[PDB]
Every structure is written in structure tokens, then in C-alpha cells.
Amino acid sequence: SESETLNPSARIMTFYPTMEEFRNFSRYIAYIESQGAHRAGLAKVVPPKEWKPRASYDDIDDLVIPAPIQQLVTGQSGLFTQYNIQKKAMTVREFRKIANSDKYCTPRYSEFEELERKYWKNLTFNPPIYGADVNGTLYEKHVDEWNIGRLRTILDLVEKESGITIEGVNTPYLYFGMWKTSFAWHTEDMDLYSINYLHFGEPKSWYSVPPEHGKRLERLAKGFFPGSAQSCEAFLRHKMTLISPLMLKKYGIPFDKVTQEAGEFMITFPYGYHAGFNHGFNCAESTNFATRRWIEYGKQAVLCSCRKDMVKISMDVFVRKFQPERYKLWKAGKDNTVIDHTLPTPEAAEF
Ligand code: NI
Numbered sequence: 041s042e043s044e045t046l047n048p049s050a051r052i053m054t055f056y057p058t059m060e061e062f063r064n065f066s067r068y069i070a071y072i073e074s075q076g077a078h079r080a081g082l083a084k085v086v087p088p089k090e091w092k093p094r095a096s097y098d099d100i101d102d103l104v105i106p107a108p109i110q111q112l113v114t115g116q117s118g119l120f121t122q123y124n125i126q127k128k129a130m131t132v133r134e135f136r137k138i139a140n141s142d143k144y145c146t147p148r149y150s151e152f153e154e155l156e157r158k159y160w161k162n163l164t165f166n167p168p169i170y171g172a173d174v175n176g177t178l179y180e181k182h183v184d185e186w187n188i189g190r191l192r193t194i195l196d197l198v199e200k201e202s203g204i205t206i207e208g209v210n211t212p213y214l215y216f217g218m219w220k221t222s223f224a225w226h227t228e229d230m231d232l233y234s235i236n237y238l239h240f241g242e243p244k245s246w247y248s249v250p251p252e253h254g255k256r257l258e259r260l261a262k263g264f265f266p267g268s269a270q271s272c273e274a275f276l277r278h279k280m281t282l283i284s285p286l287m288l289k290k291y292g293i294p295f296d297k298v299t300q301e302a303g304e305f306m307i308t309f310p311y312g313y314h315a316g317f318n319h320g321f322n323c324a325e326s327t328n329f330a331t332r333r334w335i336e337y338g339k340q341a342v343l344c345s346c347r348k349d350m351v352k353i354s355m356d357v358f359v360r361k362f363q364p365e366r367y368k369l370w371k372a373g374k375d376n377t378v379i380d381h382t383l384p385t386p387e388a389a390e391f
């Protein structure tokens with residue numbers, strides 16, 4: 041098929057839009073899907089050199105991180121579970137001082153591959169603190185291109201129709217990283233897209249599994265964490281499960297890796313599992329968004345059943361507006377639509 045022939049290896053693509061292509065966010069997402077980018081589950085977008093979301097970051101030392109998290113990781117042989125210990129609130133200044141202190145700072149290395157090895161060898165030692173899930177934005181108010189606080193996708197129909205805001209989902213979160221802080225394997229809530237911008241600092245490294253092969257990763261995880269799988273139908277949404285690339289290779293789980301540098305965007309795609317770690321002191325901004333293609337994913341998303349993860353978006357408004365011919369069938373539990381993960385979103389048609 042046409043869609044199966046684009047990005048058949050499902051490798052992470054990188055894009056360098058001109059400023060004109062960059063100005064319309066939804067349109068460029070459809071463009072990159074027209075090139076097959078979504079099949080990897082993760083794409084890099086390098087914005088125009090001339091583009092900046094903020095003039096400088098010297099004025100945020102006193103910004104409050106209300107709920108920094110000490111990440112205690114337990115496990116062996118490439119399989120781990122991360123436990124969160126909430127610490128007292130601290131300022132960015134205080135967090136940076138700890139991040140760069142001898143106790144916590146990035147180790148010496150040459151090739152990225154050496155640091156990656158250090159991460160997987162040491163992630164259960166000297167537990168770091170992640171300044172995670174901070175409500176806010178570092179964008180200056182007048183930036184209209186790729187502004188994470190107002191992307192103007194159809195996800196906006198949630199708030200527009202019901203008034204409902206979901207922090208970190210249709211509002212932005214900031215993430216202040218230090219060396220060895222991690223994000224465990226997950227797809228987004230409701231299997232949405234996400235956008236992730238690295239404002240400043242040391243890199244953030246990513247792993248991704250193609251959406252068309254996500255079930256393979258799920259089978260592995262349920263097998264190796266049989267307890268969790270008994271207790272929750274979607275325990276990866278707890279964002280506690282870490283799995284090394286050597287473990288993925290040993291069991292034939294397809295994946296790709298990429299390192300995100302300061303001033304680059306990463307896009308995750310519906311049902312794209314991703315995980316990664318920070319190289320050192322840094323700050324990223326993230327939120328979710330949608331396209332028309334997402335609607336079927338939202339209908340079919342398998343949600344956390346154990347109440348640990350509470351985020352649930354009502355799909356009824358999307359099905360009525362965009363799938364009127366299937367609405368009554370869907371309400372009756374008889375909509376057997378199957379997702380073809382290779383297809384690009386319909387807005388991509390013009391390309
Ligand atoms: Ni394949």
C-alpha cells in the first residue's frame with residue numbers, strides 16, 4: 041500500500057522546516073506524516089535558526105518547583121521499576137545548584153554511547169531529583185508559532201465544549217532535569233500526540249517503539265511484570281517501568297534512539313511508546329495535542345483500570361462531530377473499526 045511504502049523501516053525522522061512551513065503547526069504535522077514520520081512514534085523537528093520562543097532564561101531563578109521528585113529505581117538485567125519520593129518545594133536556582141554539584145552532575149565521557157552505558161549501569165544508584173510536572177510555560181506571550189500553550193488543534197474541543205482543563209494534557213508542563221533523571225516507557229494519556237521542546241541545558245535522550253509494533257512491547261512488559269499486569273490492564277501508564285535497549289534487542293522489540301539538543305522539538309505520535317533520560321541540568325516544556333487521525337486512537341485507548349492514572353477524556357464529542365456515520369454504532373458497542381497505524385492523518389492529503 042502507499043502508506044506502507046513510506047518510512048518502511050519506521051525510523052525516527054528529523055525535519056528542518058523553513059520559517060514559512062513552520063508558521064502553521066497542524067499543517068506541518070500533517071506534512072511530516074505524509075513523509076511517514078509517525079511510523080517511528082517519534083520525530084525531531086529543528087526550528088528555523090531565526091526562531092526563538094523566549095529572549096532569555098536569566099529571569100527564572102526564583103520560579104518555584106512545587107513537587108520535585110526523588111527517583112528511586114529498583115531492578116536488574118535491564119528491567120526496572122521507578123518509585124517516586126516527593127521532596128519539598130524548591131526554586132530553579134536551588135535545583136540547578138544541586139544538579140551541577142559534584143554529587144549529581146554529569147559524568148565525564150566521549151561518545152554518546154558511553155554516557156548511555158553509564159546511565160543503564162548506574163540508574164539504580166545515587167537517586168536523582170526530577171523537577172517534573174511544573175504548571176507553566178517559558179514561552180513569551182506574543183510567540184505565535186509552535187506555542188505549546190496554544191497550538192490550536194482539535195484537542196481544543198474538550199475545553200471549548202465542556203470547559204474541562206487537564207493539567208499537562210491541554211495545558212503545559214515544565215520539566216527541570218538533572219543527570220540520570222528518567223521518563224519511563226509510556227504512550228500519552230488517551231494515546232494522544234505530544235510536543236516536547238528543550239528550552240535550555242544538556243540533552244535529553246529518547247527511545248521509541250513504532251506504534252504499529254506497540255503490542256509487541258506490551259507483550260514483553262506483561263510477561264516480565266506479571267504482578268502489575270494482573271493488577272492493571274494498562275500498568276505502563278503509571279510511568280514506573282524502565283526497560284533497557286539491550287533488553288529490547290534480546291527479545292526482538294523494534295525501537296530507535298535519538299538525542300534531543302537544546303532548541304529542538306520532539307513530536308510523539310498516537311500509541312507511540314517512548315522513554316528516555318536527561319544528560320544533565322536542563323528544562324523542557326511539554327503538552328498533548330491531536331489531529332483527526334487521533335480520534336480512533338482515543339476511542340480504542342486501553343486505560344489504567346486501577347485508579348493510579350485518572351486521566352480520561354470523553355470521546356463522544358469527537359465521534360459526533362467527525363464520525364457521525366458511526367456514532368450510533370459506537371454507542372452500541374458495535375464499532376469494530378480497525379486502526380492501520382501506517383496511514384497518515386487525513387489533513388495530509390494535499391501533500
Ligand atoms: Ni515492521
Ligand code: NI
Nearest residue numbers: 227228234314
Ligand atoms: Ni510522553
Ligand code: NI
Nearest residue numbers: 252253255256
Ligand atoms: Ni509481529
Ligand SMILES: [Zn+2]
Nearest residue numbers: 272344345346
Ligand atoms: Zn493502573
